[model samples]
Target: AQYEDGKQYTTLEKPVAGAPQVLEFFSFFCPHCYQFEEVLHISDNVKKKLPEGVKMTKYHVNFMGGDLGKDLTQAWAVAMALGVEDKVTVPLFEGVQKTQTIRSASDIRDVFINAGIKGEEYDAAWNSFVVKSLVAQQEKAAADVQLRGVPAMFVNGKYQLNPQGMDTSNMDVFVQQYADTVKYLSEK
Candidate 1:
């Protein structure tokens, strides 16, 4: 009774840690995620109510654009590593999902340039061993969670949720409860 399991969310066998971490798996090419940003505003809502010290981390999915998905995910992993996601995500998302302007790796680099990321910075992180490693880890985690779609959120790697199932009363109710559940899992 402590938490709803297998309905709104699923409980992992073990929590990843106790430091109140949240991970979001997103695809730049996914329209649902794009809508979630502009319409639903889940990140903006959930982020505001999160506990202190919690970092909401985003990872790019490998299952979207085939080899292009692989490359985009690598670029996203680099963005995460460089702590420039706030700067890089909009241009990339706009090009890939909103504006339909990106289709290849060169286009991706162009978005990076537009984000004001130093060319050398993109080069270094793009080729770094850790970025590759993070991508592999990201893929494995997505597989492990049996994620069914983009725009998925996991709390401490121990809980998974679908915003709709968080509360069926209404959209506003569910969105609020959704963030609450994340806070709940963080404290647990």
Candidate 2:
């Protein structure tokens, strides 16, 4: 899966940790990101081979701001705060992309409730200072990266993976390239 380093990815200004962190920048409302959900599923064959020691995290990009955008970003932090991101992440996307069921904060909250989050837990996470802080951190990180669009990757906080020339239609190859990139950078 390896390619010439500079061609596939560029080294970061700040060095990444030895283990490497892979941050996925995406948005719930992004159609491309919604499409990417298929490749990101835990049970998906490609994700099953994720490299060891590569910590994966996702931040919801906020460039699509509106009431729903703000609500959806908060919803992401809230779901994560309650440790149910894995459960609701895809469902939330489905509701937006497939079901057309989410239009407001209340609707977003209902997605979690339908997923079985208790009302009290939902309310607490919704109003928690911790959730607010984390969302703010996500916003700052997005700004610092000068993120241009959804479905972007920042590996080890410094290196950005370049997907150019990769066959998007072949998800296996796409996932392998990311794993190979992370493996290469982690060793460096």
Candidate 3:
């Protein structure tokens, strides 16, 4: 309901207003997002501070991955479906960003397989209508935002996180204040 305007947050150009939730938009090609997701552990930090009724939705953006965008996006969806994101996210990003090994559907499947997700289950989710639907939904939502950058966080679907207002001096302080900011925005 309240924020520090340009310092703490900004209103979206086109708000995708909705329930009390946090939405994260990121791309595999972004080193910044990789650090935030893999190294800084932003999601876990914010998650710990979140109040009840506020869930998180992370959407993998296709803009940065170029030709292999959709493949990576679907790969993310399947990981989420299989509840193996904890195991696959890093390797997936590593494959795409670190060594550049992920090149196609099979490569992504291999990532899942190595993560201990059964091939049969992986295929079922990959071919499931819901997974396809989720992939399509992610594509549409990212397109709707018309995001100009990666690692973007939207609170309650309308308010965007403004780093200028938070104390980014260190990871400890940042994660604390970031959650405070997100908590404030979630109240809206």
Lowest summed lDDT window (length 10), candidate 3: 12-21
RMSD (CA, angstroms), candidate 2: 3.0
User: Candidate 2 has what TM-score?
Assistant: 0.84
Q: Put down candidate 2 lDDT per residue, 1-188, tens digits, no spaces.
A: 44665677765565445422667778888886776675544224323545665557778877775778878888888977888987898888888888888888888988888999999999988999999997996787787677777777776677877766466677777767665665565555
Error of 2 at 131 (Å): 0.7
Residue 134: error of model 1 in Å? 2.3
- Candidate 1's displacement at residue 35, Å, is 1.9
> Which one wins by lDDT: 1 or 3?
3
Each model's RMSD to truth, in Å?
2.7, 3.0, 2.2
Model 3 clash pairs? none
The digit string of per-residue lDDT tens for model 1 on 36-84 reads 6666778878899997787887778888878878889999888878888
- Taken over the whole model, the C-alpha lDDT of each candidate is 0.80, 0.74, 0.81
RMSD of 1: 2.7
Model 2 steric clash pairs: none
Give, for candidate 1, the lowest lDDT window spanning 10 residues: 12-21
Q: Once superposed on the true structure, which residue ranges of model 3 sit more than 4 Å away at CA?
A: 1-3, 164-167
Q: Residue 89 of model 1: what lDDT?
A: 75
Flag regions of model 1 displaced more than 4 Å. 1-3, 13-20, 166-172
